[PDB]
Design a protein around this motif. Sequence first.
Motif, PDB file in Angstrom:
ATOM      1  N   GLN A 262      31.810  46.456  40.123  1.00  0.00           N
ATOM      2  CA  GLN A 262      32.222  47.570  40.971  1.00  0.00           C
ATOM      3  C   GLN A 262      33.623  48.135  40.780  1.00  0.00           C
ATOM      4  OE1 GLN A 262      31.043  50.035  43.143  1.00  0.00           O
ATOM      5  NE2 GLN A 262      29.208  49.390  42.014  1.00  0.00           N
ATOM      6  N   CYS A 263      34.650  47.300  40.614  1.00  0.00           N
ATOM      7  CA  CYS A 263      35.993  47.850  40.418  1.00  0.00           C
ATOM      8  C   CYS A 263      35.995  48.691  39.152  1.00  0.00           C
ATOM      9  CB  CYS A 263      37.059  46.799  40.164  1.00  0.00           C
ATOM     10  SG  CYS A 263      37.590  45.492  41.320  1.00  0.00           S
ATOM     11  N   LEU A 264      35.247  48.240  38.148  1.00  0.00           N
ATOM     12  CA  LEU A 264      35.171  48.948  36.883  1.00  0.00           C
ATOM     13  C   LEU A 264      34.550  50.328  37.069  1.00  0.00           C
ATOM     14  CD1 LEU A 264      33.918  46.183  34.364  1.00  0.00           C
ATOM     15  CD2 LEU A 264      36.228  47.096  34.615  1.00  0.00           C
ATOM     16  N   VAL A 265      33.375  50.381  37.690  1.00  0.00           N
ATOM     17  CA  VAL A 265      32.695  51.651  37.904  1.00  0.00           C
ATOM     18  C   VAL A 265      33.524  52.578  38.793  1.00  0.00           C
ATOM     19  CG1 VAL A 265      30.657  52.803  38.846  1.00  0.00           C
ATOM     20  CG2 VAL A 265      30.379  50.706  37.560  1.00  0.00           C
ATOM     21  N   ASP A 266      34.131  52.038  39.843  1.00  0.00           N
ATOM     22  CA  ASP A 266      34.939  52.868  40.725  1.00  0.00           C
ATOM     23  C   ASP A 266      36.103  53.483  39.952  1.00  0.00           C
ATOM     24  OD1 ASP A 266      33.307  52.399  42.912  1.00  0.00           O
ATOM     25  OD2 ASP A 266      34.614  50.896  43.846  1.00  0.00           O
TER      26      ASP A 266
ATOM     27  N   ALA B 127      45.799  41.712  37.563  1.00  0.00           N
ATOM     28  CA  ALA B 127      45.828  42.036  38.983  1.00  0.00           C
ATOM     29  C   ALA B 127      45.826  40.862  39.959  1.00  0.00           C
ATOM     30  CB  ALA B 127      44.670  42.983  39.307  1.00  0.00           C
ATOM     31  N   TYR B 128      44.974  39.877  39.705  1.00  0.00           N
ATOM     32  CA  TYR B 128      44.848  38.734  40.602  1.00  0.00           C
ATOM     33  C   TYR B 128      45.054  37.364  39.957  1.00  0.00           C
ATOM     34  CZ  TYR B 128      42.439  42.645  42.866  1.00  0.00           C
ATOM     35  OH  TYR B 128      42.105  43.876  43.393  1.00  0.00           O
ATOM     36  N   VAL B 129      45.263  37.342  38.647  1.00  0.00           N
ATOM     37  CA  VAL B 129      45.442  36.083  37.941  1.00  0.00           C
ATOM     38  C   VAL B 129      46.501  35.164  38.550  1.00  0.00           C
ATOM     39  CG1 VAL B 129      47.060  37.125  36.294  1.00  0.00           C
ATOM     40  CG2 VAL B 129      45.927  34.987  35.727  1.00  0.00           C
ATOM     41  N   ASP B 130      47.614  35.725  39.009  1.00  0.00           N
ATOM     42  CA  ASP B 130      48.685  34.913  39.582  1.00  0.00           C
ATOM     43  C   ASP B 130      48.398  34.233  40.926  1.00  0.00           C
ATOM     44  OD1 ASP B 130      50.267  35.546  37.365  1.00  0.00           O
ATOM     45  OD2 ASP B 130      51.117  37.311  38.371  1.00  0.00           O
ATOM     46  N   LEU B 131      47.184  34.392  41.458  1.00  0.00           N
ATOM     47  CA  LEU B 131      46.814  33.768  42.729  1.00  0.00           C
ATOM     48  C   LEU B 131      46.002  32.508  42.464  1.00  0.00           C
ATOM     49  CD1 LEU B 131      45.392  36.766  44.837  1.00  0.00           C
ATOM     50  CD2 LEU B 131      47.671  35.776  45.028  1.00  0.00           C
ATOM     51  N   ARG B 132      45.563  32.351  41.216  1.00  0.00           N
ATOM     52  CA  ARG B 132      44.765  31.192  40.806  1.00  0.00           C
ATOM     53  C   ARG B 132      45.456  29.859  41.107  1.00  0.00           C
ATOM     54  NH1 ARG B 132      39.659  30.402  38.173  1.00  0.00           N
ATOM     55  NH2 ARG B 132      40.873  28.985  36.834  1.00  0.00           N
ATOM     56  N   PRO B 133      46.714  29.697  40.671  1.00  0.00           N
ATOM     57  CA  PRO B 133      47.399  28.433  40.953  1.00  0.00           C
ATOM     58  C   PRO B 133      47.328  28.114  42.446  1.00  0.00           C
ATOM     59  CG  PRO B 133      48.622  29.649  39.339  1.00  0.00           C
ATOM     60  CD  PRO B 133      47.573  30.597  39.878  1.00  0.00           C
ATOM     61  N   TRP B 134      47.777  29.061  43.259  1.00  0.00           N
ATOM     62  CA  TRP B 134      47.782  28.903  44.701  1.00  0.00           C
ATOM     63  C   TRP B 134      46.387  28.606  45.285  1.00  0.00           C
ATOM     64  CZ3 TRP B 134      46.217  32.676  48.612  1.00  0.00           C
ATOM     65  CH2 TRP B 134      46.608  32.311  49.912  1.00  0.00           C
ATOM     66  N   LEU B 135      45.398  29.440  44.972  1.00  0.00           N
ATOM     67  CA  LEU B 135      44.041  29.246  45.482  1.00  0.00           C
ATOM     68  C   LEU B 135      43.496  27.868  45.143  1.00  0.00           C
ATOM     69  CD1 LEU B 135      42.677  32.713  44.481  1.00  0.00           C
ATOM     70  CD2 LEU B 135      43.068  31.968  46.842  1.00  0.00           C
ATOM     71  N   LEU B 136      43.906  27.333  44.006  1.00  0.00           N
ATOM     72  CA  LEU B 136      43.450  26.015  43.619  1.00  0.00           C
ATOM     73  C   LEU B 136      44.164  24.915  44.413  1.00  0.00           C
ATOM     74  CD1 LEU B 136      42.716  26.519  39.859  1.00  0.00           C
ATOM     75  CD2 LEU B 136      41.214  25.582  41.664  1.00  0.00           C
TER      76      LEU B 136
ATOM     77  N   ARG C   6      26.262  45.235  30.428  1.00  0.00           N
ATOM     78  CA  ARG C   6      25.756  45.761  29.164  1.00  0.00           C
ATOM     79  C   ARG C   6      25.643  47.285  29.262  1.00  0.00           C
ATOM     80  NH1 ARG C   6      24.030  41.444  26.461  1.00  0.00           N
ATOM     81  NH2 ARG C   6      23.323  39.609  27.657  1.00  0.00           N
ATOM     82  N   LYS C   7      25.145  47.763  30.401  1.00  0.00           N
ATOM     83  CA  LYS C   7      24.967  49.189  30.633  1.00  0.00           C
ATOM     84  C   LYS C   7      26.313  49.905  30.640  1.00  0.00           C
ATOM     85  CE  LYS C   7      21.760  50.970  31.156  1.00  0.00           C
ATOM     86  NZ  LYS C   7      20.906  51.688  30.159  1.00  0.00           N
ATOM     87  N   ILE C   8      27.285  49.343  31.347  1.00  0.00           N
ATOM     88  CA  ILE C   8      28.609  49.939  31.403  1.00  0.00           C
ATOM     89  C   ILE C   8      29.214  50.011  30.000  1.00  0.00           C
ATOM     90  CG2 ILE C   8      30.985  49.617  32.198  1.00  0.00           C
ATOM     91  CD1 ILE C   8      29.782  48.335  34.745  1.00  0.00           C
TER      92      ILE C   8
END
Length: 97
Positions: free
Chosen positions: A25-29, A83-92, A56-58
Amino acid sequence: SESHPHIQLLKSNRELLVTHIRNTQCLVDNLLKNDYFSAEDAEIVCACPTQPDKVRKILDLVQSKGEEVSEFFLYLLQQLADAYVDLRPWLLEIGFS
């Protein structure tokens, strides 16, 4: 034209892209907001039965739209990946699964 590096980069990494992209969805939007995808294009993606099929369609649509759209798409994945990669450490650490 005759040279299409961005289009080719997508084509060669199709399966890698279909299995590593887990959000369509973020891609299509973004493609819509930037006027690279029309309402019908989005509609065509929605009609796919699975998410891997949507990716595949996109990719098919993006590749056929051309070099400008394929270049845009690649920079879009780069930006989304940052965009959100830097939240991985924290979320883990917060034991968030």
